[PDB]
């Protein structure tokens, strides 16, 4: 019980209305992974009713990114500046 898969961030379709990623999941609900926990270091995505857990390939400059689009506030910025 632990995270064999692994989905790139950009496969993962995000939810901006939600501040959240999901996956399509056969079951009755879809992977959830939130930016919360993503920006905590941790990722993996975990659906409800079925109970499966996966995990995400995140980048600091897709979080800065999807936290511009999501509606999130401002993030402490990465050490990537020029
Ligand atoms: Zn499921």
Redesign the pocket.
């Known amino acids: 019980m632990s995270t064999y898969d692994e989905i790139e961030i950009e496969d993962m379709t995000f939810e901006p209305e939600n501040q959240m990623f999901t996956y399509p999941?056969?079951?009755?609900?879809?992977?959830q992974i939130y930016l919360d926990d993503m920006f905590e270091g941790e990722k993996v995505a975990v659906?409800?009713?079925?109970?499966?857990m996966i995990d995400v390939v995140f980048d600091k400059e897709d979080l800065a990114e999807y936290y511009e689009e999501a509606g999130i506030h401002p993030p402490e910025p990465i050490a990537a500046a020029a």
């Open positions: 999941c056969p079951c009755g609900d879809r992977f659906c409800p009713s079925c109970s499966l």
